[PDB]
Structures are given as structure tokens and as C-alpha cells.
Design an enzyme around this catalytic site. Structure first.
Site, short mmCIF file in Angstrom:
data_model
loop_
_atom_site.label_atom_id
_atom_site.label_comp_id
_atom_site.label_asym_id
_atom_site.label_seq_id
_atom_site.Cartn_x
_atom_site.Cartn_y
_atom_site.Cartn_z
CE1 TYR A 26 -32.21 12.80 -18.73
CE2 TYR A 26 -30.27 12.45 -20.12
CZ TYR A 26 -30.95 12.23 -18.93
OH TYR A 26 -30.39 11.45 -17.92
CB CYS A 27 -34.43 16.65 -26.50
SG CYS A 27 -34.97 18.07 -27.31
CB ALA A 28 -37.81 12.64 -26.87
#
EC number: 1.1.1.100
Lengths: 220, 229, 229, 220
Positions: C136-138
Site C-alpha cells: 500500500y505504501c509502494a
């Protein structure tokens, strides 16, 4: 990898634990070191540990002329390390002093088309901390980027080290350490290490950067 | 200072300019180097120049089973350097980001046990520039996001996860450009000059050191000031 | 100020809390709203509440031909709002980033002709938090990188490309959490309180306006100060 | 969407083109406006255009007591807008003045558990520009984030607007506009628009942010 042999570095606030860790490391890497600060007695005990290839400059940065004078007093200068350092008081110490030191050092370093300036922001505080320290730190980084662009073609790099928490009651600690993923405080040698790298020839293509040494507390 | 004696480093993309510069430097500093990549002859020449303390690993990032197999088939891995597979949106996202996530996950599997590691993700070089094609820009931002999230999550287990972001690096005798193109790129760079591979290698070595212990989830930009973070 | 009379907006994910809040607000401000998503009954209820000036577009982001078909099948598209398909690394990368790139490319195809557009990419809500799972961060970092690169490239052609990044948004009567979990999240947020969908919707409307013309390639964080950029 | 009816806003540097565009917009959105600055004559001509629901405060921010006094002079204050604004001179005007204004406004806004503070950085210059303006802008943003965290539970948001180039010889322009993807300068109304949004109830969950209004010149 990192060899500072032949260089002269000036470290302000050289008797703080960060200042002195930087001074020893740069000296150990072959730099002649000008250790500057307001506590002559502590500088001298640093000096004794260094043994040779250093010079003490007893200096109060709070005075503008004394910042301006500090650099002239020096003939060779390859590396400047500006340690930190009333809203007005913090801004004047952590930002206005540093401007003068940087500007004066640049005037010297232009003549050789070589130089390294590393500005070190004060230790947190304090997620963003008190407004005065947070303003002055940010200001110092903005200052660093601006001077970086200005001296870039003339072989001078200008960079910032941002330490996180470097070594309360058990409540206050819990509070901080919870904001540091690594779960511990840093040590002065962690900052010294970053500084030596940026001060070396191995960081010649690195300018205008801030390098955070903070245990993952702020990721940038 | 940066003594990698008795360490093992794996470098993907070891045959590119940056890759081989990283390989030589980390070897010079005392580390065994698992030099990995797809062209074997290129990789053998580097190996030949390295002389000792390496292993070649012919390997195709594109294959997801082969990335996962890459890391599980190395024994003592202290340091992982993921070079960019980059010069289809889906494709570049798949090599520069997805590939790198298997490598990173699989390395943390090994490193968490030993409670010590270094992971260093390298974004793709800036192109003829700075924001770039969307697909390279996305994967690069993406890599850096991945690097923060993995950094946070292994931060108590003696593994640092960091990225290096080069700018315009010149690797080749000629860059393929004419003077106008060259001036146009060099105008983007305050230093008024190109990066060379050793620039990136020095940054990687710095992060890979035992003394880079308190430094995690950072992006070290080696770009002649063209981008200041 | 934010008068979207005679404009058409397409909102993917229109049935989520944020999606439907964006749909109602943009409609309230005078825009026809192409309300798009996979659950049709959810989408019909929203449509029913909207009453007029909408079209439903049942649609499955996962299908790459169906994303591309989504935009080409709308006629006058002034504003595109891509909501996150997000609560496999590959999977979330594929919906949150790849899907969104087709939508974005296909919208610029239509908008460049009309020399006017607004594209607004919305990252996925923070989870129980801030750095998040890597995947999700990516994708989120990735989305934001994509948003800068497209912003640059259409910046002379009267299209702005911007992102909105919410923090913890509460959309549901209950959040599924216990008090300890709740306190743990609310401790991440300086404001000491949750976002609600209308918070994100207001930000989207601001960017979608004619007067947001000089604002491009920015990320507007609506997160109660939990992250300051 | 944006209704400022019932509110009182104070705009410093209200006779600049940015200051006055902000004042008109907030007034047009229903805010009573306190237009402050050092040029009484220009403030009055702004006043005439506003017609009613405003008050002029002739004020020199360069003086610290006058910053401190400016806010007390005001009973209702929902919205403060700090326009910009010797290294020392720029820092003192663009950063120290603003600290006082912000701090004093916070003391007032705490009592109501409501408020909006928007700090506006000066126009570029100048990629990072001169060291003094770049330092003060960064400092102001660091200041904004810090005060943001501090007042967050008390219903006050603190945010920054960073204008890019707002409306030389044809050489100098070419130079700038080439750094702006959009290919043109902004207008004061572009900044005013961002400010009105952040000053409204529709930005109640937005705090500590800097919003760049710059034509894509800096993407953050």
C-alpha cells in the site's frame, strides 16, 4: 574509503558530544582540525585527546563579528562543520550564526574551487518540537539547499545532517523512543559518521541534501 | 569505517556501470560479492577482474520464482543491493518495483534470524529529465515508499533499509547524445557535471557499513544537486 | 468559487464512503457525475439519491481493457477522480497504481484536445498505520510519483494532475475496532479525531475547480496533521 | 462550498497584490476583514473597494511590540493570514514577525477552540532563491508544522501557502517561465483561492500542510 588526509576542517560547537565526536573522527581520518567553541577548558581537554594537528579557536557564535572573524583566522579550510547552536535567540544562534559561517567559508572555498560545508541541526526536540527549534532547523536546511545551488559549479558541496535523538524519567524516554522505530537513541558517533562521509571526496556528487540520522524516526 | 570483512553482499544488475562499480567497491572493502544479472559473459569478465571472493548468479529478474530463488540460494547474506532494471508501464513497474519487493522480502527472511542486515534499493538513473516518464517516476517513488515501509518494520531487528537515488550518471565512453541534448541535461544539474558510477557505489558502501546502523528508511540522493531532499 | 456547472466528472470507486461523498459534492456543485464501480446495487442507491445528472458505469478496475474502455466510453470528461481500490503485493500495485495509470492516460487523451482537465488521484486510507504495509505504501508513493510526472507533461495543455492523500478516514457507523485499537490510531493524529469522507470530498472539489488552475502535481494531505508535507 | 459568513479574518501585508487579493476574496466570502499593513493610503483605497465589514490597522511588522499589539487590538479573530514580509532583515520580517503574530493569535483562538492560521511565504525568488528568502520560507514552514501539532486538539489549524511566481527583461522572464511547467506566472487570485479554502470549514482536517501554488514548479 574515506580519507581526509591533507585537509583542514573547522568544527563549531566542538565541545558538545556531537561536535567532539565529529572532531575526533575527522582527525582520525587525517584531517587537521580547528576545534572552535566558547568553552576553552573543554576544548583544551578535547585538544589533549587529539594530541596534535588541531587548533583551538575560542569563539562565541552569538556575536556576528566573531563568526565573521572565526573563518578569516583560518588559512586552509576544506571542510566546515556547523554544529547547533526566546524565539529570537534560537534563530540567531542556530540560523544567523550559521549563515555567516557558511558565507564566509564560501568566500574562502571559492578561491580553491573546493570545499565541503555541513550544517548540523539540533537534536530533537519533540516530533516537530518547539516552534523555535523546528523553525531554525527547517530554515537551516532551506539555507543549505540555497547555498548548495549557488556554489555548485565551483566545486563546493553544501549539505545538512539532521540528527534525531542522540544520547529524563522513564516516562519521558518511553515517549521519545516510541517515536523511533529502531527503539533506541543514537550516539554522537552516528552523526560523526555521516559528517565524515559528506566531508570526503566520496560525496563529491552529493550537494543540497539533508541526511537524517534518526533511527527511522523521519524517513526522507 | 566501512570494513566489510567477512560479509556477503548480493548485487543485482552487477554488469551495468553502477552495478559493477558497486561490486568492485564492496569487494575492495572486504566483502564477498554475489554478482548477479542476466548477461553471463559480462558477468564473467567482472568476475575475472574481481579475481576472488565472488560468485556469479545468472538470473532473470522478470521471473518471480527466479527472484525468490535468487535470495534463498545464497547462504550468508548481510547486504542486498537491488539495482534498477531500467533505462510498457506494467513492465517497468514489474521489474523496478515488484521484482525488488521479492528480493527485499526474501532478504529480510534471512536477515531477521541473524538480526543484522543492510538493504539498499537503487532507483533508476534520470533520463534525457527529473520527473521522467510516468512509469519510471512511479516505480522510483514506489521503490522509495517500499523502502520506508520495510525500514519501519525491521527497524527493531538490526536491519536497515535505505535507498540511493542517482541523477544523471554517465556510465559509457559515449552517452549517445549530441551537444544540444548534453547541454540540456547538464543545465538540469547544479554541479554542471555528470555522475559517474563510483559516485553511487560510494553512497551504497556508506549505507552498507556497520556504522550506518542508525540510518534507515532514507533516500540518499547522488545527483549533483539537481534534486534536493 | 467551485462551480462545476456544465462539467462532467467521473468518479471510480463511487460506492465507497469517500467515493460517494465525492460524487454527491461534485453533483451538488453542478457537475454531471459518471458514478463508476463494481457493486451495481450500491451504485443504484447512490444514483437514486443523486436523482439527476448522473450515469452509472458498472465496471471492474482489475480488467485493463475495462479501465481503458471506461474512459473512452464517456463523452465530455472534464474531471477524473480515481479512488483507491484498497483496504498480494502484485494485486494492490495492480489496482492502486496500474489501473490508475490507464485511467489517467486515457483521460489525458480526451482532455488534451479540449485543452482543459482535472485529474485527481486519491491514495488509499491509512490502516490500523502511517507507513503501512509495503504494498500500500509502494502503490501510494507510486501514485503520487505518477501524479507528478503526468502533471509536468500536461502542464502546458490546461490539465492539472493532483493527488489527495487521506489519513484515517472513518466511513462506517462502526470501525470494527476495540477501544485500545481506536486510541492507538487516534494517538497517531494530532487533531485527535478521524477524517470523515466529506473531508476528502472537499479537498477534491477544491482541486477540481476552475480556480485551481495554477495548482498542479501537488499532494493535498487531509489527515489531521498526522503527516505534514 | 466555501462560506466565511460570521468570521473575522486578519490579513497582514494587506496592500500587496497577494494581500489584497486575499482580503477581497475572504470579504467576498462573507468574512469581516481586518486589513493590516504599513501603507495607510493603500490600505484605505483597499478599504474603499471593500466598502463595509472591514477595519484598517496601520502596523509596522518590523517592530515586535507592534506585532504583539496588532492581535490584541482584535476581539474576534477566526482567521489569521500572514503575508510575507541583510540576512537578518528578511529573517526578522518573514519569520520572527510571523512567530509573534501566530503565537498571539493562538492565545486568542485557544479561548474559542477554533481558528485558522495561514502563513504565506514570499514569491520566488530563483529555484531555491537567495539564502535569506529560502531560509526564511523553509523556517516559516517548519514553524507552521510545529505550531500545527501544538494547537491541533484545540480546533485550530495552522497551514502554509507557498506561491511560486506570481505576476524584468525578456531574458529574465524566459529564465523563470522555463522553470514553470505551466509556462506562465500565477496571479494573486490563485493564492487567494488556496487561502480561502484553508481558511474555511471545508479544510478542518487539513493542518500542518504547505500548499504550493506554483504551476507545477515544485511538486509537493
Amino acid at each position: 574509503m574515506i580519507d581526509l588526509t591533507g585537509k583542514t576542517s573547522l568544527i563549531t560547537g566542538a565541545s558538545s558530544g556531537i561536535g567532539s565526536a565529529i572532531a575526533r573522527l575527522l582527525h582520525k581520518l587525517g584531517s587537521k582540525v580547528i576545534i572552535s567553541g566558547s568553552n576553552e577548558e573543554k576544548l583544551k581537554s578535547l585538544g589533549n585527546a587529539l594530541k596534535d594537528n588541531y587548533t583551538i579557536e575560542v569563539c562565541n557564535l552569538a556575536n556576528k563579528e566573531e563568526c565573521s572573524n572565526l573563518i578569516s583566522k583560518t588559512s586552509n579550510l576544506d571542510i566546515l562543520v556547523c554544529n547547533a547552536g526566546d524565539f529570537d535567540k534560537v534563530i540567531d544562534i542556530n540560523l544567523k550564526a550559521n549563515f555567516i559561517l557558511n558565507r564566509e567559508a564560501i568566500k574562502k572555498m571559492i578561491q580553491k574551487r573546493y570545499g565541503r560545508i555541513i550544517n548540523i541541526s539540533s537534536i530533537v526536540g519533540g516530533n516537530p518540537g518547539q516552534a523555535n527549534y523546528c523553525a531554525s532547523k527547517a530554515g537551516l536546511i532551506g539555507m543549505t539547499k540555497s547555498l548548495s545551488y549557488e556554489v555548485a559549479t565551483r566545486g563546493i558541496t553544501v549539505n545538512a545532517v539532521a540528527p534525531g535523538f542522540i544520547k529524563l524519567n522513564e516516562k519521558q524516554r518511553e515517549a521519545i523512543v516510541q517515536k523511533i522505530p529502531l527503539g533506541t537513541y543514537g550516539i554522537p558517533e552516528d552523526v560523526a559518521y555521516a559528517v565524515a562521509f559528506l566531508a570526503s571526496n566520496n560525496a563529491s556528487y552529493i550537494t543540497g541534501q539533508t541526511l537524517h540520522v534518526n533511527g527511522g524516526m523521519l524517513m526522507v
